[PDB]
From Swiss-Prot, chain A:
Superkingdom in the source lineage: Bacteria
Assembly, per entry: In cyanobacteria the RNAP catalytic core is composed of 2 alpha, 1 beta, 1 beta', 1 gamma and 1 omega subunit. When a sigma factor is associated with the core the holoenzyme is formed, which can initiate transcription.
Function: DNA-dependent RNA polymerase catalyzes the transcription of DNA into RNA using the four ribonucleoside triphosphates as substrates.
Region of the whole protein represented: 978 to 1026 of 1318
Protein known as: DNA-directed RNA polymerase subunit beta'
UniProt similarity note: Belongs to the RNA polymerase beta' chain family. RpoC2 subfamily.
Protein's gene: rpoC2
Organism in which the protein naturally occurs: Synechococcus elongatus (strain ATCC 33912 / PCC 7942 / FACHB-805) (Anacystis nidulans R2)
UniProtKB/Swiss-Prot annotation, chain C:
Record bears the keyword Nucleotidyltransferase: yes
Record carries keyword Nucleotidyltransferase: yes
Gene: rpoB
Free-text function comment from the UniProt entry: DNA-dependent RNA polymerase catalyzes the transcription of DNA into RNA using the four ribonucleoside triphosphates as substrates.
Family: Belongs to the RNA polymerase beta chain family.
GO cellular component, one term: DNA-directed RNA polymerase complex
UniProt-listed PROSITE patterns: RNA_POL_BETA (PS01166)
Entry-linked NCBIfam families: PRK00405.1, rpoB
InterPro entries attached to this UniProt entry: DNA-dir_RNA_pol_bsu_ext_1_sf (IPR042107), DNA-dir_RNA_pol_bsu_external_1 (IPR019462), DNA-dir_RNA_pol_su2 (IPR015712), DNA-dir_RNAP_su2_dom (IPR007120), DNA-dir_RNAP_su2_hyb_sf (IPR037033), RNA_pol_bsu_bac (IPR010243), RNA_pol_bsu_CS (IPR007121), RNA_pol_bsu_protrusion (IPR007644)
Species this protein is from: Synechococcus elongatus (strain ATCC 33912 / PCC 7942 / FACHB-805)
Keyword annotations from UniProtKB, A to Z: DNA-directed RNA polymerase, Nucleotidyltransferase, Transcription, Transferase
EC number: 2.7.7.6
Highest taxon of source: Bacteria
Protein's name in the database: DNA-directed RNA polymerase subunit beta
UniProtKB/Swiss-Prot annotation, chain E:
Keywords, sorted A to Z: DNA-directed RNA polymerase, Magnesium, Metal-binding, Nucleotidyltransferase, Transcription, Transferase, Zinc
Entry EC number(s): 2.7.7.6
GO molecular function, one term: magnesium ion binding
Organism: Synechococcus elongatus (strain ATCC 33912 / PCC 7942 / FACHB-805) (Anacystis nidulans R2)
Binding-site list for Mg(2+): D462, D464, D466
Enzyme's top EC category: transferase
Cofactor: Mg(2+); Zn(2+)
Catalysed reaction, written as an equation: RNA(n) + a ribonucleoside 5'-triphosphate = RNA(n+1) + diphosphate
Cofactor, free-text remark: Binds 1 Mg(2+) ion per subunit.
Family under the similarity heading: Belongs to the RNA polymerase beta' chain family. RpoC1 subfamily.
A Pfam cross-reference name: RNA_pol_Rpb1_2
Name the UniProt record assigns to this protein: DNA-directed RNA polymerase subunit gamma
Record's GO cellular component terms: DNA-directed RNA polymerase complex
Length: 46, 49, 1061, 163, 620
DNA sequence: CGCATGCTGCTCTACCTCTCCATGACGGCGACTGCCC
RNA sequence: UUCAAAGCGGAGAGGUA
DNA sequence: GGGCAGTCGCCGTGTACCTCTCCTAGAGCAGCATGCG
């Protein structure tokens, strides 16, 4: 009939994480700031 | 088991030549050891580390 | 128990092959014509005139031959123009025949063909999601045999086609090349503008350019041709000899796409392609009646058995034969020909031999006991020629699907690399003529179960819209379902409904498990992992000297023994007139005589006995269906793999530690747990260019003290006790060098002894077939009786394994309040951490049964009748035994299952009472006489000069690289260097070390091992200039290349270390 | 990229690039050690921190050479930080033109194939590629460390065979 | 003082390859060349005179015996026969001599053409596809474009292009003197010989000095390769083969199956194919055959040599009897089952055994139980030595006959042979260094090894089917080192973390817990006073108090109670200044502003047993 | 009474080509390739 | 004076820990 | 030329032990049993 959308609130790590860390691979997350400054405007645009 | 065995073999071959040959390099550098804590709670005390 | 014949997959498949499997392949190839069209060969493949086997089953078994028949097909040769027809019958091949138990006998060994679970032919739709793009859908069309087709939808709304593994190309080319005008493909499609987008983007094609482009893309580098494209398409998809959907493929296509094409046509047509494109468009546009497919569903998977695989092999052989016939028929100008001289049956014979002897689908039979034999024929494999590969199978194929319910057992699998890749058929399941597994159900009308209306068999896809109840629901008079809420399954989910809304009910509570798992009482109180262990270990037990039934059996034992074909039942309802150790005779009421002959001390594939013994006495009244004689692993009628012994749960003085077992000495001198094992030895007398070989007792360099038991013909006598290193058959070879003969007579291997029971021998000039170049064959059989001893493995039905560590004299064992010493002491630490609670139930019920002489039977999942049925039944039985016996110490109300036990060494009672009972334990095939090995010095490998490996050839133990790492972490330098050189392949240091040890001096320094030199030679042979150098001492001198392959010491260097004298 | 961020910041702030390389490598090393130890301690397993430090220093001890001044070092070569520093110092003591470099993070398989002995590398992985490269360069192996005295059959240079 | 110091690798020149083979004889000719593809004689098991198993090249098959049989005896040293010219010496030299095959046409080494980096393509400044097309006879290449306008050096032509250029060059009208050369064969030898490394390096440096863009890495790679070839003093044209070597015949042997059939190796087939094609091509070149067939023969010979060097790398795999691939020279060394990982980094050894393990209590840690049937085999030389020295026997043969006959003296000798001799025990998945340990053996009766219960967690062992392997050390250094570094009684802590590793684990902790616990019921004899702990133990041993009763004992020492009240209680200031403080579990009595006079502890007989056991073990 | 023909065992050598033998694995890393400025 | 006649490679399937 | 997405091909994927079976096609050449007048 329909397909409801919702947000759930939800971690353990094992061998894949260790192998990824020791082989120095590229994960997909964690945008990293590049220069010092002192203000972080979130800027919720239209 | 296969994943664990492959990882151990790679670890052994990367670091086989580390043997102790010297007594002292005469430096003044090191790191800072502190307890491992999850915010309010501590997980590993400093004395064990 | 509505159980029909348990081994019926093999029988049905072979009957189908004989009835209509060979005819269909023979008649699809008959009209072989040459290019001039003058001669024709017709194979009237309808008679087959099978010739009776020349050897019986037993003759084939004892001669080590093959049980088979011969096939003869009638053929006719027709010459055109001049009328000339010749008729004859040609020999086609030898077909091995299936015995009465579902197995084959190849070269004197029992073999079984395994069933294979594969993917069914048809069309399968799938949706794939790009990293940043939309959802794109693809469809794959897969036949039984031929080329595959693939359709794909792009991100812009374009439809592309891929044939086999060529480059992609728009669907317009393919649809126009097939011979379809625009109007019909516009009408058949439901949403024509979606395809109109592709038409506009890719440009309209006419037939000529459609075939031009199709030829260009399929076969690049050649000049395009219209006839070329036509022939290419006709050979690719429309050729019966090259393309085959199958009956199942046509059925699946019609069922999914909703077509109406006839069942007889088995090649692709235009409507199928149009319907597949339309279904893809609708699935893209979310029409409403379209859905992607699941490939693990048991409705999309098929079973292939011996009939289909044999059909494929016959087809390949026939293709090769037709090639030979066509090549040979044209070489002669004048006819001077007959159909007999035209066909050559060598390729077909070779193909059949390769399938039955060297394939990976024909397997060596498991024959330890009747249960292993029964479950080896009901096994389903996902690997083989046409299935999966070990490196490609992943997590999704080894899981449990909700569609396995009642069709594949969820418990019985291997552990390790094969876990989830081999499965077992459930108890009530059966395979229909399309290849899909079914299972039975009873109908429910208005909440009433109709147990008198012929249960219906249903496949996985059928029972998805119905609400099906489990087999443990309780009814009041075999009628209305009791309760107010009932568990049901609807669309692969578990729910609960009112019992006026269910549709079908399963037949039995054991419909979900296999036959090996159905023999475990109190199963619902066990964990699943230990249930797997117990079911697996029940098939490794050894038949004992005097078998015995369990006291707490489950009810399926008499049915698991009737399929091995070793129990004899009387069909007569008469009287018995003659009983003997080898013959039984029963006379009816004026209905002639029935006589049976019994096998005596034969041998199985795994060296176990196959005896058969009678039960009845002379002049006995006998009814129909009554057991008359029974086999080596059955008591009267039913399976009997273990023994009932007294058990107590408590720790001893460290002898129970971590799965070890402490037993008594009564189990040794009472001949409990003793078995007979028979071995076979063989010698061959061949001929050589130097001369022939003679079997005789005139052996050189031997004294009369080593020829006592030979029969003046060089062969040992029946009934002789042979110890290790004893001559069995004496042979001499004609060496070239006076006396020119050398002695290599065969002797028993080290560690073998027993009695000689058979010396059957075969020779030429007597009607016996022999391998080429051989004169005679001699086979000797040696038997022995083995007792239980320290190091043997014991097991129970609930997963508890152990190794025996001590055998105590009977005055040391703990004893009961009546003076009876125990038989086995088990550790209670192993029960609560593994959750085998059923063994305690079994022990207590066995105690009650022994005290009552009752032999109870309990069926699994017995709690549908009460809240705690097992505990109440056990307590009531124990109380009744206490009241009947008269002894108050049997049962106590304060501690129900526990009684007082004393110490045999000091006489003082233990502080608290312990649990005692009767347990049914089994002895496994892992015995310590076959696991002990040692070596000092022996044979060496030829290339690397390292010690050989293997127990049977005095082999060494491997020192892998993990052990090298462990020795490096210790700081060890001298142990490692001694292991690497002096004890492995330092060809000169081995003898020096041995002589130094014997003489008492110091071991000298080693050199360079031989494997390094072998590697240097191998690298040099690859055109690499590698060498070892010695550095220069002074400044401008050059470094000097060292020659490794040159010994400087001109001392003895033998191939193997030798003792000086 | 965290390594690049740290190197760029410390090169913009500090003068000499040697200290920037050292500080960047130090920060990345600490992050890696802490992450691995946290993953292990999430379960009920405890290991000492020296064992992980020994392995991690094998991954962050090299540098990529860029614009060698006058030494025999073409761009694109991976060299130890200490060797580069010593060569640059001994060359620029007289007043020559130094070389540039950038720290890199290798990994556990890419670092085992960059050893100075072709016998150890050929016995680990990719035998034909290693052997072809060694044949072209004319390399020589002086038999130092384990896994090479084991192959020949000599006393290993560790333990009782140290001297 | 060692034999050699380092290992060096390089490219092989044709002179070196011919020098590896081609030995000399006391005559006017050399012998070391393989010319015919015959391996062995069918009628008699002998090798032919010029083949893969020849005896003039590779040495005699039987030591100190010639092919014709005229010579014999170890008297004949360093003298060659005359009828067949076979040197008379040991047969072991058969696994040294190499020989070689001379090719009628040059071929290219597949390692230097088809690689992840291709070195021929890098050196020649050409893409891999063009070089691969020039090889295998798919296209032509221009070697000299002299006196022309539309032709450039190293430009790929075609059959039609070559024909149309021939239509002009053969007219010889004008403007076409100095005929250009094109060559549809390899001609890689000519292109690689034309290299002038020094000026190429100078030009490359001059170009790399100026301008970088973003794609000067190609010139950097070229400069690296050129500098390598300059420094090594090699020649690039050595990457194209003109002769090949042959491996000695014992590393590719012929084995005989049970039924008399032969199971020959996979290298013999590849060598046979190469030799047959080479001989056929040479024969065709002799008769001056048409060139369009000679080119086919050359292409087939290239493919054959390529399949010998490495099978299935460039083209199609060569299948043998079945549809399974043949094993080439690179498959010997490259895999997990290759020489490196199977024969050099781990081997099979002597004086070793294996058996099942059972539990042995009453053993001490550092002791093991070895069955009597394995010890008599693993310890044979020491038994023989002891039999010869003491209990004077005679020779070794008599000692071996005595062992075989199973004399009673054998076990008496063995029992004193094995005492003081450590033995190493090992379990299958050795995950850390505590998976191999040394024990002292004790002869047991049976066929199973007895293992102490306190070492199971280190081995990860268990008594439900596990098996163990046994090795023995031979020399004095190995024995001293096993006793001093590996013995099981000095392995208390673990190397991963300093936590103890030998602790009571399963059934001993349960017994200690039961013995030292408390029981509200079954408390006969509670409240009785004892002097010292031995009195309490003696009173319990002969049944007069329960194992869980509460009794007062006199104990002057240090106590550690649980649920204790650290604050003094019930202080009674008695006469004469004597103070008797009564706690919950102690009754200390102290003098006036002085020391302690006495102490009593309220405890349980099981606790007294536990603590007395520990103290007695420590003090003795 | 004797004459003509298929079957079986041993020996001896030589190799290339397809309708391609499969189209259910998964990640990483380097080298072509068509397309848009 | 001599030794000396018992060892062999690959592929597939299953099992124990 | 610069810069790509996109794609094709090669590399890698636990240790020790036990049991069973089977192992190259084609062609050429010589000697013994069988149906007929
Ligand atoms: Mg175990
Ligand atoms: Zn000679």
């Amino acid at each position: 009939l329909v397909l409801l959308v919702f947000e759930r609130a939800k971690i353990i790590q094992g061998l894949p994480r260790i192998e990824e860390l020791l082989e120095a691979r590229k994960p997909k997350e964690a945008c990293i700031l590049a220069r010092r400054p002192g203000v972080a405007h979130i800027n919720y645009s239209d | 088991t296969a994943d664990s065995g492959y990882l151990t073999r790679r670890l052994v071959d990367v670091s086989q030549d580390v043997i102790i040959h010297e007594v002292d390099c005469g430096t003044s550098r090191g790191l800072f050891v502190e307890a491992m804590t999850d915010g309010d709670r501590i997980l590993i005390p400093i004395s064990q580390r | 128990f509505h159980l029909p014949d348990l081994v019926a997959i093999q029988r049905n498949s072979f009957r189908w092959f004989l009835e209509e499997g060979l005819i269909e392949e023979l008649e699809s190839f008959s009209p072989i014509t040459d290019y001039t069209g003058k001669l024709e060969l017709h194979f009237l493949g309808k008679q087959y005139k099978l010739k009776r086997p020349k050897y019986d089953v037993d003759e084939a078994k004892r001669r080590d031959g093959t049980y088979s028949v011969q096939m003869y097909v009638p053929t006719r040769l027709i010459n055109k123009e001049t009328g000339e027809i010749k008729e004859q019958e040609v020999f086609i091949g030898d077909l091995p025949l299936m015995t009465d138990r579902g197995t084959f006998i190849i070269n004197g060994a029992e073999r079984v063909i395994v069933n294979q679970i594969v993917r069914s032919p048809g069309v399968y739709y799938k949706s794939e999601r790009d990293k940043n793009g939309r959802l794109t859908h693809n469809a794959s069309l897969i036949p039984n045999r031929g080329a595959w087709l693939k359709f794909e939808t792009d991100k812009n709304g374009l439809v592309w086609v891929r044939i086999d593994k060529t480059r992609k190309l728009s669907a317009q080319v393919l649809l126009k090349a097939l011979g379809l005008s625009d109007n019909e493909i516009y009408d058949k499609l439901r949403h024509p503008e979606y395809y109109q987008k592709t038409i506009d983007k890719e440009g309209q094609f006419s037939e000529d350019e459609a075939l031009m482009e199709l030829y260009r893309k399929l076969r690049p580098g050649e000049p395009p041709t219209v006839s070329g494209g036509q022939q290419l398409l006709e050979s690719r998809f429309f050729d019966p000899k090259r393309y085959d959907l199958g009956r199942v493929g046509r059925y699946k296509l019609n069922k999914k796409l909703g077509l109406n094409v006839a069942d007889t046509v088995r090649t692709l047509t235009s409507e199928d392609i149009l319907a597949a494109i339309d279904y893809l468009i609708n699935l893209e546009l979310d029409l409403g009646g379209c859905e992607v497919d699941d490939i693990d569903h048991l409705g999309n998977r098929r079973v292939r058995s011996v009939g289909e695989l044999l059909q494929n092999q016959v087809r390949v052989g026939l293709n090769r034969l037709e090639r030979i016939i066509r090549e040979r028929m044209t070489v002669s100008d004048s006819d001077s020909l007959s159909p007999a001289s035209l066909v050559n049956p060598k390729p077909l014979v070779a193909a059949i031999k390769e399938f039955f002897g060297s394939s990976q689908l024909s397997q060596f039979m498991d024959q330890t006991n009747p249960l292993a034999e029964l479950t080896h024929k009901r096994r389903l494999s996902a690997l083989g020629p046409g299935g999966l590969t070990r490196e490609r199978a992943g997590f999704a194929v080894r899981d449990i699907h909700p569609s396995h319910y009642g069709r594949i057992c969820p418990i019985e699998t291997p552990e390790g690399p094969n876990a989830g890749l081999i499965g077992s058929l459930a108890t009530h399941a059966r395979v229909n003529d399309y290849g899909f597994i079914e299972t039975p159900f009873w109908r429910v009308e208005e909440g009433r179960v109709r147990k008198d209306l012929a249960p219906v068999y249903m496949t996985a896809d059928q029972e998805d819209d119905l609400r099906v109840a489990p087999g443990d629901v309780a009814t009041d008079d075999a009628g209305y379902i009791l309760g107010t809420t009932i568990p049901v399954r609807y669309r692969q989910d578990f729910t609960t409904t009112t019992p006026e809304r269910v549709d079908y009910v399963a037949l039995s509570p054991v419909q979900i498990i296999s036959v090996a798992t159905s023999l475990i009482p109190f199963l619902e109180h066990d964990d699943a992992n230990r249930a797997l262990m117990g079911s697996n270990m029940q098939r490794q037990a050894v038949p004992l000297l005097r078998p015995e039934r369990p006291l707490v059996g489950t009810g399926l034992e008499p049915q698991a023994a009737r399929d091995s074909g070793m129990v004899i039942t009387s069909p007569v309802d008469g009287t018995i007139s003659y009983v003997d150790a080898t013959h039984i005779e029963v006379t009816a009421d004026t209905g002639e005589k029935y006589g049976y002959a019994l096998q005596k001390y034969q041998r199985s594939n795994q060296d176990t006995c196959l005896n058969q013994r009678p039960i009845v006495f002379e002049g006995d009244r006998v009814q129909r269906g009554q057991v008359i004689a029974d086999g080596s692993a059955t008591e009267k009628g039913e399976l009997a793999l273990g023994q009932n012994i007294l058990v107590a749960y408590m720790p001893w003085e460290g002898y129970n530690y971590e799965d070890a077992i402490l037993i008594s000495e009564r189990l040794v001198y009472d001949d409990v747990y003793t078995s007979i094992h028979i071995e076979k030895f063989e010698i061959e007398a061949r001929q050589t260019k130097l001369g022939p070989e003679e079997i005789t007792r005139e052996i050189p360099n031997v004294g009369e003290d080593a020829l006592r038991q030979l029969d003046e013909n060089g062969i040992i006598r029946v009934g002789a006790w042979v110890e290790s290193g004893d001559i069995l058959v004496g042979k001499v070879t004609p060496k070239g060098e006076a006396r020119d003969v050398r002695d290599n007579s065969l002797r028993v291997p080290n560690g073998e002894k027993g009695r000689v029971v058979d010396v059957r021998l075969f020779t030429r000039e007597q009607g016996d077939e022999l391998p080429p170049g051989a004169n005679m064959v001699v086979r000797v059989y040696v038997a022995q009786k083995r007792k239980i001893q320290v190091g043997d493995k014991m097991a129970g039905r609930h997963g508890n394994k152990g190794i025996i560590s001590r055998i105590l004299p009977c005055e040391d064992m703990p004893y009961l309040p009546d003076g009876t010493p125990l038989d086995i002491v088990l550790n209670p630490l192993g029960v609560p951490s593994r959750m085998n609670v059923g063994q305690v139930f079994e022990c207590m019920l066995g105690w009650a049964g022994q005290l009552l002489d009752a032999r109870f039977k309990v069926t699994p999942f017995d709690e549908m009748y009460g809240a705690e049925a097992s505990r109440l039944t056990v307590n009531a039985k124990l109380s009744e035994a206490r009241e009947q016996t008269g002894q108050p110490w049997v049962f106590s109300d304060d501690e129900p299952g526990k009684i007082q036990v004393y110490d045999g060494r000091t006489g003082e009672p233990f502080d608290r009472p312990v649990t005692v009972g009767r347990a049914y334990m089994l002895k496994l095939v892992h015995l310590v006489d076959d696991k002990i090995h040692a070596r000092s010095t022996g044979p060496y490998s030829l290339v690397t000069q390292q010690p050989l490996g293997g127990k049977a050839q005095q082999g060494g133990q491997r020192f892998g690289e993990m052990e090298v790492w462990a020795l490096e972490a210790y700081g060890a330098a001298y142990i490692l260097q001694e292991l690497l050189t002096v004890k492995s392949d330092d060809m000169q240091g081995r003898n020096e070390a041995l002589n130094a040890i014997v003489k008492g001096k110091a071991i000298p320094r080693p050199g360079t091992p031989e494997s390094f030199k072998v590697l240097m030679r191998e690298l040099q042979s690859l055109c690499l200039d590698i060498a070892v150098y010695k550095a220069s001492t002074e400044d401008y001198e050059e470094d000097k290349e060292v020659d490794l392959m040159a010994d400087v010491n001109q001392r003895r260097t033998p191939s193997r270390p030798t003792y000086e004298s | 990229d965290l390594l690049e961020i740290y190197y760029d910041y410390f090169r913009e702030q500090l003068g000499e690039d040697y200290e920037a390389a050292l500080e960047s490598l130090r920060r990345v090393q600490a992050l890696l050690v802490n992450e691995v130890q946290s993953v292990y301690q999430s379960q009920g397993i405890d290991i000492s921190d020296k064992h992980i430090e020994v392995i991690v220093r094998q991954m962050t001890s090299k540098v990529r050479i860029d614009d060698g001044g006058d030494t025999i070092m073409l761009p694109g070569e991976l060299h130890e930080l200490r060797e580069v520093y010593n060569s640059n110092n001994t060359m620029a003591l007289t007043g020559m033109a130094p070389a540039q470099f950038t720290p890199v993070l290798l990994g556990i398989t890419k670092a085992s194939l960059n050893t100075n002995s072709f016998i150890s590398a050929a016995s680990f992985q990719e035998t034909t590629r290693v052997l072809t490269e060694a044949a072209i360069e004319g390399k020589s192996d002086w038999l130092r460390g384990l896994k090479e005295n084991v192959i020949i059959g000599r006393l290993i240079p560790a333990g009782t065979g140290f001297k | 003082e060692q034999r050699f110091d380092y290992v060096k690798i390089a490219l092989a020149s044709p002179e070196r390859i011919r020098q590896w083979g081609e030995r000399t004889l006391p005559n006017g000719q050399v012998v070391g060349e393989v010319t015919k593809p015959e391996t062995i004689n069918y009628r008699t098991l002998k090798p032919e005179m010029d083949g893969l198993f020849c005896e003039k090249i590779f040495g005699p098959a039987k030591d100190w015996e010639c092919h014709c049989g005229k010579y014999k005896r170890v008297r004949h040293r360093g003298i060659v026969c005359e009828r067949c010219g076979v040197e008379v010496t040991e047969s072991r030299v058969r696994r040294h001599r190499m020989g070689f095959i001379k090719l009628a046409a040059p071929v290219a080494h597949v390692w230097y053409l088809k690689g992840i980096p291709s070195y021929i393509a890098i050196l020649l400044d050409m893409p891999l596809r063009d070089v691969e097309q020039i090889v295998y006879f798919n296209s032509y290449v221009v070697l000299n474009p002299g006196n022309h306008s539309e032709l450039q050096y190293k430009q790929l032509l075609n059959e039609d292009q070559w024909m149309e250029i021939e239509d002009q060059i053969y007219a010889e009208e004008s403007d076409l003197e100095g005929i250009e050369v094109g060559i549809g064969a390899e001609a890689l030898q000519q292109l690689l010989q034309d290299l002038n490394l020094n000026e190429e390096s100078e030009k490359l440096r001059q170009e790399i000095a100026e301008s970088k863009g973003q794609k000067r890495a190609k010139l950097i790679k070229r400069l690296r390769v050129i500098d390598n070839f300059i420094g090594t003093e090699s020649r690039p044209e050595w990457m194209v083969l003109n002769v090949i070597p042959v491996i000695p015949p014992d590393l590719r042997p012929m084995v005989q199956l049970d039924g008399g059939r032969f199971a020959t190796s996979d290298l013999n087939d590849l060598y046979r194919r190469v030799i047959n094609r080479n001989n056929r091509l040479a024969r065709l070149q002799e008769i001056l055959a048409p060139e369009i067939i000679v080119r086919n023969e050359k292409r087939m010979l290239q493919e054959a040599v390529d399949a010998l060097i490495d099978n299935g790398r460039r083209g199609r795999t060569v299948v043998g009897a079945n549809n399974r691939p043949l094993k080439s020279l690179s498959d010997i060394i490259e895999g997990k089952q290759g020489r490196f990982r199977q024969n050099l980094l781990g081997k099979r050894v002597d004086y070793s055994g294996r058996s099942v393990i059972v539990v042995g209590p009453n053993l001490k840690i550092h002791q093991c139980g070895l069955p009597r049937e394995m010890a008599i085999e693993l310890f044979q030389p020491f038994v023989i030595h002891r039999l010869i020295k003491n209990h004077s026997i005679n020779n070794i043969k008599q000692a071996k006959k005595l062992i075989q006959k199973n004399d009673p003296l054998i076990w008496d000798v063995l029992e004193e042979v094995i005492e003081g001799h450590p033995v190493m025990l090992n379990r299958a998945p050795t995950l850390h260094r505590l998976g191999i340990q040394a024990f002292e053996p004790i002869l047991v009766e049976g066929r199973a090894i007895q293992l102490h219960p306190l070492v199971c967690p280190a081995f990860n062992a268990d008594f439900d089917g596990d098996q163990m392997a046994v090795h023995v050390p031979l020399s004095i250094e190995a024995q001293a080192e096993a006793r001093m570094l590996m013995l099981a009684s000095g392995n208390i802590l673990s190397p991963a973390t300093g936590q103890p590793i030998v602790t009571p684990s399963q059934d001993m902790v349960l017994g200690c817990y039961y013995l030292t616990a408390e029981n509200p019921g079954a408390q006969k004899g509670a409240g009785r006073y004892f002097a010292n702990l031995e009195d309490a133990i003696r009173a319990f041993e002969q049944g007069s108090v329960d194992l869980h009763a509460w009794v007062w004992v006199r104990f002057d020492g240090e106590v550690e109670s649980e649920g204790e009240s650290d604050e003094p209680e019930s202080v009674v200031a008695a006469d004469d200044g004597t103070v008797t403080k009564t706690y919950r579990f102690r009754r200390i009595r102290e003098t006036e502003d002085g020391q302690r006079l006495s102490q009593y502890v309220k405890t349980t007989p099981g606790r007294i047993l536990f603590n007395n056991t520990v103290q007695t073990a420590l003090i003795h």
